[model samples]
Target: LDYEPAHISLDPQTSHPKLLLSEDHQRAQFSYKWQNSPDNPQRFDRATCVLAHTGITGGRHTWVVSIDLAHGGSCTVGVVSEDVQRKGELRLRPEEGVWAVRLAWGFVSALGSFPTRLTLKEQPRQVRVSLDYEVGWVTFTNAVTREPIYTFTASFTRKVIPFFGLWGRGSSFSLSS
Candidate 1:
């Protein structure tokens, strides 16, 4: 993709109310405590996740996210349809409308057709996610080295929104752009 990466913002209305977004809306974090929120149908009732309000329909785009893996927590980052299941026990996989990689317990796993482990030289502090709708692929790469970590290829048939999840106390993830 030759396009410059775009800034994606969190949609607070669609996120778990307890999830707190940064003042700029470019970052999201779990507040570690529950907050009162309307019982909206679009809100993730059971997950600590958020969906970007802006999504790509058919084109190429890329963005970077910084995560503190050493702090020890669970996080998933990638893209999903805005209509993804928000009110159930969700699995971080395609059937649930997510194509992502998860970091948990010092292990990295691709949330593709299923969870697949990835061996890395070290935990990455910065990562990039690129989507090629025309080619029907979503790729996760090491931002520092531009190296492929994992790629998920499927016949992508719908628009996709950025999706991220944070779990565990003190764990934080943010969009660098």
Candidate 2:
């Protein structure tokens, strides 16, 4: 409850051609057919990911992401530095300026310098990302069970923005208000 709720919306300009953003820009779903989106510098050309419109530079901010895995796919939800690469193949690791937790094929892991596998009592369809920018830590938790999944500590030198990655025909990520 200490975390300040952050209002996050997906930036259509930063989304890949395979990602379809909802009208409200709060959800991103994989499109079977590529979307006719413009090729911009902010857009992710090779990676199936999207960044939030706003970046956080200080304080604690929190948001929840609801994952749709029924279609059988994978997703990574977390934060990425503003200067991170967007036009090519990207690695979702801290060393790559991305701090996130990934869920794929029933396995959960933390994308760090060295990937760390996470074992949970129950898989969470909804995960919470809590970022303490000043404290330099990002924590991923099971929103439903309130279980801590993993925490990544770093000395951030640049602004960080929320990140969502979806890979599957019908896979999607929904941001909760």
Candidate 3:
């Protein structure tokens, strides 16, 4: 593989909705709960994730298990089971599918917010992950519920280009906006 390993993420063990996906250098999946709030507790609503991938050359490269914190709308997989009263879907581009994180009122959703990994076996293949919790929040946050949870997203990508490690085009989105 010419490119380095890919990364995934999960939130710390908190009252928030935590994603306990796996990373075995190949295929992966995860499950977790979504707490409505800290002051008030809710059900341990569950979600499951699966992954697959290929190589660059536009060939799927290393599979990217995505979590939909990005609010592009209409582009998220149904992770909420359609039975909950989640106000909106946090869009994320996770592996094998779109990470559609369902959310109730009061609590905000991050596509891969508090990302974590599990290892007690029970999966298809090994996948590697580097946690990036804030990716989903950027497109959601205040924009989703109209409530202010995060002011603005601060990330390395915000400081430089989409693909760093080189020079020429390290300052903006690869696509022309």
Candidate 4:
């Protein structure tokens, strides 16, 4: 609904697409504050939760997120790629009877990723799931920033070094978004 930098994978290990919720359980809805993160202003916000130190392997990288997931229930998310044609698994993590989950993805185009969520329900003991981006007619309008996420496709044209660690500069993605 606001502006921010688009997210790049730490690569390799695949991310769990964190819930990124506030303490109030407000999700997909984030407000501006100084301390809270995952939803913090990208330009001035950096990692508040999630794991750091990717231990990236050459053309492969790794990223991770952790969730209590309604107590020891399980959930997993992952992403893999061949030359940035990436794919991933990201569970929104707010499902009702989701006893367990595993997500996988493949990025078809540099701009498009097919993220799938596989939920293992407690009842029939079957998996159920969908995408965070393509989950229905939910067209993303004011979804991104004024700049539009596609603009970032030209990232290779500009050269910038990361923090030399896990965190990138400009904590939040206010400008890049």
> In model 1, how large is the Cα lDDT of residue 61?
86
Q: Candidate 1 lDDT, tens digit per residue, 58-176?
A: 87888898886435787888999767888988777888778889876568899855479998876777789888878878888878877778998867777789888888777777896
Point out where model 4 deviates above 4 Å: 1-51, 58-66, 71-112, 121-177
Stretches of candidate 3 off by over 4 Å are: 11-33, 37-123, 127-177
Model 4 over residues 1-177: C-alpha lDDT tens digits?
222223332321221232132332211111233332233222212212221112222221211222222222332222211122112332222221111123122111111233232222221111111112211111111122221111111112111211111111122111111
Listed per model in order, the count of residue pairs whose N, CA or C atoms clash below 3 Å is: 0, 0, 41, 24
**Candidate 2 TM-score to native:** 0.96
For each candidate, give its TM-score against the true structure.
Answer: 0.92, 0.96, 0.20, 0.20
Ranked by lDDT, top first: 2, 1, 3, 4
- Candidate 1 wrong stretches, greater than 4 Å: 1-3
Give the poorly placed runs of model 2, Cα more than 4 Å off: none
Give candidate 4's error at residue 131 in angstroms: 22
The top-ranked prediction according to TM-score is: 2
Pairs that collide in candidate 1 are: none
| Model 2 poorest ten-residue lDDT run | 87-96
Q: Give me the displacement of residue 39 in model 1, in angstroms.
A: 2.1
Whole-model Cα lDDT of every candidate shown, in order: 0.81, 0.90, 0.23, 0.20
How far does residue 34 in candidate 3 sit from its true spot (Å)?
Answer: 3.8
